[PDB]
Amino acid sequence: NAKTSTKVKQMMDLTFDLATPIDKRRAAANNLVVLAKEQTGAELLYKDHCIAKVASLTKVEKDQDIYVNMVHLVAALCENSVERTKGVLTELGVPWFMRVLDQKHENCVSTAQFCLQTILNALSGLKNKPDSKPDKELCTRNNREIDTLLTCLVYSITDRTISGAARDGVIELITRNVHYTALEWAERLVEIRGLCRLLDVCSELEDYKYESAMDITGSSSTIASVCLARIYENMYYDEAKARFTDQIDEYIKDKLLAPDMESKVRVTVAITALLNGPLDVGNQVVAREGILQMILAMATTDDELQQRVACECLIAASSKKDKAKALCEQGVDILKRLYHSKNDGIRVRALVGLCKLGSYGGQDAAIRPFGDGAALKLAEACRRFLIKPGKDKDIRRWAADGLAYLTLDAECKEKLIEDKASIHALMDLARGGNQSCLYGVVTTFVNLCNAYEKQEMLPEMIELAKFAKQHIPEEHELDDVDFINKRITVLANEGITTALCALAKTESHNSQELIARVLNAVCGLKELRGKVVQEGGVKALLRMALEGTEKGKRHATQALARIGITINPEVSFSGQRSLDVIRPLLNLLQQDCTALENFESLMALTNLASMNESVRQRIIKEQGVSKIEYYLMEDHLYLTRAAAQCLCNLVMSEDVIKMFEGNNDRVKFLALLCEDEDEETATACAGALAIITSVSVKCCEKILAIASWLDILHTLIANPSPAVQHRGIVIILNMINAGEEIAKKLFETDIMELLSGLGQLPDDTRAKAREVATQCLAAAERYRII
């Protein structure tokens, strides 16, 4: 370790003395390198009081590049070290990270969050790997620090010291970690009265700032609602959902005494955020009570502020098919009135209120919603708000909430996709990352792509769904297809991938499902796969494939499968990515997925298995061999080919070979697949079995154990496919060379005679087979000399 030590000190130095200029950065970006996990690397910088030097350099440091690489440095050191972590928590305070968050320069928030995460990780045994759970043990030993960490975060939520960006980053951090049960953060947070604190952020008004104000962003109310909801998803028993709703209920009662306008305006804005979050709780609260009456009342006054706020609440109240049919009675009349307001922000909100109510229920009567031209009319209204240059505002967020409903209508989809100015407006909105417009904009995109969940018809006899099939069902009926594709193309072409990645920041599984639907839809066109990759699609989809809705994950995985088929995986999935993706892809191989999902998975896995022994290795450890194998027994013209082709790349790993050596019919069935009518299927199999017999004497024996293996070997030798026969005679050589007693069973049959017919002949179509055959005869000579 002589070497390492010296460089460390060389770099430590260059970095911290302000002499070295653009030389400083070299040391930094490189400093960070040497720690990278490597213990004998970190152990030192910790020991040469690096943590301290970083605390000095950072308060003075003005170059944003060096500054960031410094925080990475702190993270690198904590990584998987309870010690250096505990140690680091003492030398800088948790509040030192909470300051990196509030630094108002670029890339701070992501990096701050990465340390905090790394810290939370080391303390609890969490590894920064997909589907890692925390060590129950380390969660007890360090529960003091783990908890000191949570309480820090909850107390940062409403802290008026920090700016919006940082508040978001904090709330996000909490959303991400609440679900792990060995941490009990869901419960622990509800004790510290975290819910009230989240609600406080929700009811912070971004327009009119009442005297008591914290700095927020467009995404603050949304981000906070998703948190509220995620926390509730983890109130497991009935008693815990109790404590939750009770805390909320209480928080409302409190605000509703001394009901000045501020107190009223805030409670309703919070209730709105609460419906748009944990819906049941939102509803149990609207019930108790006559807050419905209170809202209607506010909507009826003549102050545009109560109007505004009350609309959003009405709009939010309608999120039940049940409580909307119940709501129209009284409220619709107010909405129609507000729909006539000269106040743009009010009109548009009222318009969304009405589009939402109007949307139920376009399956039931089979009769489409907004008949008789209402759909086109309302859409035109939304178009005008969307383009409206006159207010450069969040009036657009609502225009698009509107189109998320109208766009279910065919004619509407079509006007909209023709309307380039509006497609740009929508792109500019998503591109601007503002989380409050995700639902509207992305749903509109889903609609235009026809990517909404179709009517799912399932089979009696699931086990037979794929058997013997000779064709894979198109996703769309033939009339629709070309219009749909023209549409998906105009989206892809105005950079919908970058725009959605901007939004993918979200922690909402349901929000991720929408995004995953649109990206899958794009990847459905091979010509567009290129773009998606180059606009950063793979990183987003990979996250979305590992954590989300069962359906959302599915869509995201299939979109990755598609990219994998067309952009070589050595490029689209290097390097850690090629490993992370394997688990999700194997899940597309299950019986309840579509033949298309199976096929696109098999194809991608074949490509992935071709990379290195490392990716093969992950495929194996995840039970993948048997999951893929299943398809060889369907007589499916595409599924079986793909599976055979994939398997032909797995046998490159000796560990797979050992599977063929065991007690099973892997060698049997692979040999029988050699007689397959489909050339490519037969080629992959004889290829694979050639590879196997080339390295496994035991496998050559298993072949001789097959019912009428000689019949099988005749078929190979005389195969019309010059490729199969080449692979086939190679198998025979591999057996001959495997041992005298295998060779002898062979020499007892007409095989050697047969093979003496394929004499050497360099320029022939079958030159290769002739060559291997000549060597077969020659091998049988070595034996006879003895």
Specify whether the CB–CB gap between 500 and 539 falls below 8 A.
no
Say which CATH number the domain at 27 has.
Answer: 1.25.10.10
348 and 397 fall within a common domain: no
Which SS3 state, helix, strand or coil, does residue 592 take?
Answer: coil
Task: Tell me, rounded to whole angstroms, the distance of Cα 345 from its chain centroid.
Answer: 35
> H-helix or E-strand containing 485?
helix 478-493
Structure tokens given for 117: 């995460």
Do both 263 and 370 map to the same domain? no
Q: Are residues 751 and 644 in the same domain?
A: yes
The reply to whether 156 and 198 lie within a common domain is yes
Tokens of 488: 């998906």
Contact at 8 Å (CB) between 519 and 531? no
∠ CA 783-751-709, nearest 5°, is 105
Same domain, yes or no: 274 and 386: no
**Interatomic CA distance for residues 574 and 581, integer angstroms:** 11
CB 544 within 8 A of CB 512: yes
Point out the domain boundary residue: 358, 391, 406.
358
- DSSP 8-state class, residue 738: T
Q: How many CA atoms lie within 13 A of 361 on its CB side?
A: 9
501/470 same-domain check: yes
Three-class SS state of 314: helix
For residue 394, give every residue at least 6 positions away whose Cβ sits within 8 Å of its Cβ, in sequence order, or none. 218, 345, 434, 436, 437
Residue 204 and residue 152 share a domain: yes
Q: Let me know whether 460 and 470 are in one domain.
A: yes
For residues 403 and 471, membership in a common domain is answered with yes
Residue closest to 308 by CA, chosen among 213, 205, 436: 205
Report whether the peptide linkage leading into residue 575 is cis, meaning its omega lies within 30 degrees of zero. yes
* Cβ 309 vs Cβ 315: under 8 Å: no
Domain co-membership, 540 together with 507: yes
User: Is residue 289 reached through a cis peptide bond, with omega within 30 degrees of 0 on the bond before it?
Assistant: yes
Whether residue 373 sits in one domain with residue 269: no
| Distance of alpha carbon 551 from alpha carbon 329, whole angstroms | 35
Q: Which two tokens stand for residue 607?
A: 């490509």
The C-alpha torsion from 684 through 686 and 691 to 693, rounded to 10°, is 150
Residues 6+ apart with CB under 8 A from 82: 122, 123, 138, 141, 142
CA distances from 643 to 275, 295, 606, 627, 638 (A): 47, 60, 8, 10, 8
Give, rounded to a whole angstrom, the gap between the first and last alpha carbons of the chain: 56
Closest CA to 241 of 231, 250, 251: 231
Dihedral sign for Cα 352, 353, 356, 358, please: negative
Work out whether the CA dihedral 112, 117, 122, 123 comes out positive or negative: positive
DSSP for residue 454: P
Last-in-domain residue among 358, 378, 403: 358
Of 358, 377, 393, the last residue of a domain is 358
Contact 679, 727 (CB under 8 A): no
746: number of Cβ within 10 Å: 22
Q: Are residues 580 and 557 in the same domain?
A: yes
Q: What is the distance between the alpha carbons of residues 449 and 500, in angstroms, rounded to a whole number?
A: 14
The total domain count for the chain is: 2
The DSSP code sequence of 379-415 is: HHHHHHHHH-SS--STHHHHHHHHHHHHTTSHHHHHH
Q: What does DSSP assign to residue 763? A: T
Q: Distance from CA of residue 206 to its chain's centroid? A: 31
Q: How far apart are CA 343 and CA 401, in angstroms?
A: 18
**Tokens coding 534:** 């180059």
CA–CA separation, 332 vs 296, rounded Å? 10
Which residues, in sequence order, are CB contacts of 176 under 8 Å at separation 6+? 117, 507
The 3-class secondary structure across 188-228, one letter per residue, is: HHHHCCHHHHHHHHHCCCCCCCCCCCCCCCCCHHHHHHHHH
Element (H, E) at 45: helix 39-47
Separation CA 343–CA 633 (nearest Å) = 66
Whole-number Cα distances in Å, 115 to 111, 133, 397, 452, 689: 7, 18, 34, 38, 50
Q: Are 179 and 235 in contact (CB under 8 A)?
A: no
Structure-token pair, residue 436: 């409050």
Three-state secondary structure along 743-769? HHHHHCCCHHHHHCCCCCCCCCCCHHH
Q: Evaluate whether 194 touches 235 at the Cβ level (below 8 Å).
A: no
Cβ–Cβ < 8 Å for 601, 561? yes
Question: Which of 644, 626, 717, 625 has its CA nearest to residue 687?
Answer: 644
Q: Give the range of the structural domain holding residue 710, as residue numbers without chain letter.
A: 359-786
Contact (CB, 8 A) for 82 and 42: no
**Closest by CA position to 698, among listed 746, 741, 738:** 738
Give the chain's length: 786
